[PDB]
Every structure is written in C-alpha cells, then in structure tokens.
Design a protein around this ligand. Structure first.
Ligand SMILES: [Mn+2]
Ligand SMILES: [Mn+2]
Lengths: 381, 381
C-alpha cells in the first residue's frame, strides 16, 4: 500500500528487540528478537542488527519496499536533559553519554543500538523516546527525595520514574475505553511485566510513580528487589565481603521473584505454587503484598480514583495476580467480577463488578506503537 | 508511700535519658536528660549516669528511699534473638554484642549504659526491652524482602521494625479509649517524633510497619531519608567521591527534614514556612506526601480499618501535620473535625468528625511507663 512505517528498536545488554509497525493502523509487519549477544553467533550489536535484517527478510519484509520513514530508539533514562522525543544527531548523542552514571546498566546498550542503526540506515531520521519523559514534571513533593539538598541538586538525584511510554499510552487507552475525556480522569496504572511499576495520574499529569532514581525502586519484579532499606548496602559491605557494585548487581539481577523462588517467569511460578513449593508461594505473597500497598498508597495520593488498569505481560494475562492484588478491598471501593477476570481474554476490558465504585480494567499496552506515533509527530506530523 | 518504681534508661551516642516512674500509678517522680556526652563536663557514660544521680538528688529523689525494684534499658535492635523483655546477665550481654553489625549506630550506646548501670546499681535486676520485639512475628509476606534468599537468611536480613513499645502501647490505649476489645480491632498507629514510623495492626498482631532492617526506612524523619532507591549508594560512590559509610551517614544524619530545610524541629519548620521559606514548605510537603502514602498503603493491608491514631512529639501536638496527612480522604472513609483537632490539647482524644467511617485519634504514647510495666512483669509480676 501507500502506508508509512517506523522501525522501533529496543537495544538491551544481551538482546535487541525490533518491530516494524504502521503508526496509523497499528499493524506490525514483522517483530522479533535477537538474543544471546556477545556470549554464540552474534558477538556484537552490529551483528545483531544485520541479523535482524535477515529475520525481516526471511519473514518477507524488504525495507526499501516498506515505506520506512523513521527509526525509533527506546532509551531508558533521559535524566533532566531529555524528556520529549528527540531527533538524533552527533551533538545530542554526546549529551546522552553524560547520563551514563545515572543509568550505567540500562543506557549504554541503547547508545550502541543508535550508533549501529545510524550507520547501517543513514537514509532516514532516527528518534530517541525516553522512558523517564512522561514523569519529568512530577510534582516536587513526589519527585524530591528527603536527602541533603546540596548533594541531591549537584548530582541530579530525584525520582525520575520509568515505563513512561506505557503509563501514558495505557492512561489514554483507559480514557478511550471509558469514553470519557482524559483531562477529567484520575487513575492508577499497574505495568506488571519483567520490570514492574505503578503510577498515579491526574488528567494528563502524573502525580507519583513507583520506580525512582533508577528502575530498581518500588514493586517486587522478576529479578529486582523493589523497595528495601538502603542500609542493606552498607550492611552487606560490612558483613558479607561484598563491594557496593556486587550489592547493586544482586539487587538488580538476583532479587525479586527469582531471588525468592529461583524462577523469574510468572507462569513457571504458578506451576511451582500448584505443586506445593513453599518458596514459590512466599515469593508470590511478597510480590502481592507490595503491590497491594502501592494501590492503597496511590488511592490516597489521588483522593478520588475513577479507574485502575492492569497492563503488560503479567497484568494482561495473570488472573490470579489481579484477583489477589485487589481482594478484600470492597471497603476501599474496589470489587472484582470473577467472570470478567477470566484468564486467556484479549482486548481492553472491564474486570470490576458493575457496581464497583472504582472501575478496574485490563488495558493492553503497546509501547512500540506509541513510540512509532511519537516519531511521526516530532518529524512534522 | 509503699510504692515501687522502675528507673528507665535510654542511652544514646551523645545523650542519656532517664525517668524514675511508678508502674501502677504512672506518675514520674523525676525525669531528665544528660547531654553533649564526650565532646564538655561529661566525657563518658560513667559520668553521665553519676551526673543523672546528681540530677535525681537536686530534684529531691533518694534512690534508697524510693522503692526501686528494677532498671529498664531501651535497646533498639534485638535481631531475631531477643524479642521479649530479657533479664540481663553476662551471657545475655555477650549475645547482644553479636547484634552490632545489624545496629552499629543505635545499639553500642545502650550496651555502655548497661555496663555502667549494672556496676553502679548492682542491688537490683536489670531488664532490656527491645524496640524490634513487637514486630518479631510480622507475617512472612511483610517481613521478607525480595532479595537473594541465601544471602538474606545467612546475614539475617529482614524487616525488623522499630518503635515497637510505642506502637504496642498506643494500640492498647486506643482500644481502651474506644472501650472495645483489642482483639477485635484493626488499626493504624503513626508515631511521628524524631524517628517517624507507621504500623498496621490486627488485634494483638502487627501486619506491617514502615521501618525496616534498620530505623532508616519508611517515613521522612527529622534527620533520616526514609524510603529511597538503594541505587543512590552506588551512584554516590561512583560520582561524588563518597564511600558507603559516608552515604549511610548522610542518609541517617543529614537527610529528612534537616536535609531539605536546614532544621530538624517541626516547630522551627512551621516558623520558616510562615515567613515564606520555600525550602521549608518543600520539606514539609515531601514529609506529608510520604505520610499520606503510608496511610493509604496500610488501609489496603488491613482491608477494614477501625481507627487511626497519631502519637509522639509531632503526632500529639502538630495540628497542621494531622490535617494535611488525611485531608481529601473523605472518599477513603476519613473525615477530620477542625474543633477536635485544635493545637495545645492534652489526653487521648477523637479528632475525627462524628460520622467518619474510620475513627481518628490522638493517643499520647508513654514508652517509659510501658517499659516499667514490662520489667515488673518479667520479674514475677
Ligand atoms: Mn514492554
Ligand atoms: Mn519517644
């Protein structure tokens, strides 16, 4: 057809995800992942993108015949410098390198992705979309940690927040599903995927969110601790023969659900629980307790809440998680309906009972589509 | 009279507080503080207790003529080893020394207090009461952090919780004020003093509390950060030329309200706010936002909440804090009455409106009295 398309890239430490997608229709011509980078047949990100071109081809796509208008790059951390979708050039990239102590785990891979893509696809505009952007204007009372002001301002320490593309997109789609204007709505979004984060949103403006300086803070996640006394770092440095980097690494990769149960995948977790694994049930109960607290905390932040929406891989599919996250909260205005909450369902949908004072939905997220539409917009429309 | 009395000691790094108190009547024959220890006329804790005997004398007390039956010692951290009031001897003390990496800031001073007191008052039983004790049996889902299980179990890492004496005592006094059995009540207690912590309590059993491995976690406090991404430690070690101990120290002493405003005392803070100090208003708003979240989180933990009680130096006296902590929560069941919430009031009292689905009280805490009654009990009654 005469349809235009964006190639959306999510470049991680050892993986590269891509989707070629039509921003007007939302259809994805092709999608895939290149894994096990630099361990194996794909030693670097240059090979990974070349390998992705093969995958696109053997899947029937020809990039010249496809209406390619831009390349979107997911960058986790924009600091206080980049919050809007940003057209990439050499100067911008130099400024991005200044963010790498704020995001030493998550940002450097995205920048490798950008270098490779701009070289192998120099014919088209490249755009960065930042996971922190939606949250740049959090209220000061929520964005500011209670630490020494001088040091916080000097090293740009604040609650940045992440999954900003998902939280924003889901908040818009919840408004659309309810057929009510976004500007008049107060809502909570629960993005429960590999990373897990919650947000409280009034109209178009977020009021709070669970991730922090980095994507470690907040909810229990697949491999991340979420909330824990920062004293654990000093404690382990003093007792367990660990340096600060060993502790940070453990909190990011050996914690969360995998730290408590030995698995990171929630389907695997449910199998373990059903076979009587005590550690798996504990891990699930720790996850669920943390999640319930954040829902409560955000009902209090908002004061009035119209809708709570579950999203991402767990939120979209795990009926038990959703049941256990809001059970016993009838007196707080939340009532779930068992039929509406059934597993295997697709599409934006109501899972609350009809008379629930607060509406509860599942609203599938589509970060790639939202990033494709951001790219299209910033390039003149 | 024929009245018996306990000398309750709270020994800190640079201070020693004491109160001589009648456990049956609750009257305090004498109370005071010895300050600026080892900086000055009182270089060590041996001098501080001798100096406290002077203070007791010049205030009209004679310890032999006073009915002294025990000495109570406040110990912050009991780990997993001590949770009930514990009669002190040399063996117990040896085991307490094993807790000093869990509590390097708070415990060592208490142990100096114990050594001095047992030497200068060898005629009577000495008892330790632990700030962690009330929380020893938190549910596993609340007590367990989502980190590597092996390492957590090896180094005894869990949510311990503190102000346990206050939370328990206030929960009992709230039941007494409402004339309803404790066992049937679900409640939240907000101990807002120098340290600040919240608890959620079902009957006689706590379900969660805001302090953690150490007294740093949770609410914003006078000089403590409360909740912050643990990544801040690694971040500052990598950027700001700080070691892990410098960061820990900053979070404990140069953070909270003093970190954001330059003052730690809430009366001073209110003066600054009233004169138009922007930093003081920000500090207050950060404190208040954190507090509102914990109230919300704990309403969700409990599912049904009968009563919320404010206590300690701020909770008992700062009407603005209490107003701002629960305003705009009518839809969550909380309605405050302006007349009932007036400053300067004394005694256990209702601050909610009559028709508030959830009752809100101020319930003055008396940790010394509760510790005196614990000492009396464990020594045969
Ligand atoms: Mn995703
Ligand atoms: Mn106190």
């Amino acid at each position: 057809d005469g349809a235009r398309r964006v190639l959306v890239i999510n470049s991680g430490s050892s993986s590269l995800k891509f989707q070629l997608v039509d921003p007007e229709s939302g259809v994805a011509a092709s999608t895939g992942i290149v894994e096990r980078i630099g361990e194996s047949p794909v030693p670097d990100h240059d090979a990974a993108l070349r390998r992705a071109f093969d995958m696109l081809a053997g899947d029937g796509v020809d990039l010249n015949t496809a209406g390619l208008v831009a390349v979107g790059h997911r960058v986790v951390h924009g600091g206080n410098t980049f919050y809007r979708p940003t057209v990439l050039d050499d100067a911008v990239i130099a400024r991005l390198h200044e963010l790498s102590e704020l995001a030493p785990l998550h940002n450097p891979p995205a920048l490798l992705g950008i270098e490779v893509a701009r070289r192998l696809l120099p014919g088209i505009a490249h755009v960065a979309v930042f996971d922190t952007g939606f949250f740049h204007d959090l209220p000061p009372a929520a964005a500011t940690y209670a630490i020494d002001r001088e040091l916080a301002d000097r090293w740009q320490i604040r609650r940045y927040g992440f999954h900003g593309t998902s939280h924003r997109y889901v908040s818009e789609q919840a408004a659309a599903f309810l057929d009510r204007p976004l500007r008049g709505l107060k809502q909570i979004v629960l993005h429960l995927g590999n990373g897990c984060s919650a947000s409280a949103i009034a109209g178009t403006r977020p009021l709070d969110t669970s991730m922090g300086l980095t994507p470690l803070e907040g909810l229990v996640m697949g491999t991340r601790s979420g909330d824990i006394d920062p004293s654990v770092v000093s404690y382990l440095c003093h007792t367990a023969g660990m340096g600060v980097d060993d502790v940070e690494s453990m909190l990011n990769h050996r914690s969360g659900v995998v730290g408590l149960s030995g698995v990171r995948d929630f389907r695997r977790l449910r199998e373990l629980i059903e076979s009587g694994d005590g550690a798996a049930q504990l891990a699930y109960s720790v996850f669920t307790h943390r999640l319930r607290k954040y829902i409560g905390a955000y009902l209090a932040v908002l004061g009035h809440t119209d809708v709570i929406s579950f999203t991402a891989g767990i939120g979209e599919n795990d009926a038990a998680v959703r049941r256990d996250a809001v059970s016993g909260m009838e007196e707080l205005g939340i009532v779930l309906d068992e039929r509406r909450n059934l597993p295997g369902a697709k599409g934006a949908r109501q899972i609350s009972a009809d008379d629930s004072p607060i509406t509860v939905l599942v609203v599938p997220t589509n970060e790639e589509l939202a990033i494709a539409r951001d790219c299209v917009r910033v390039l003149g429309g």
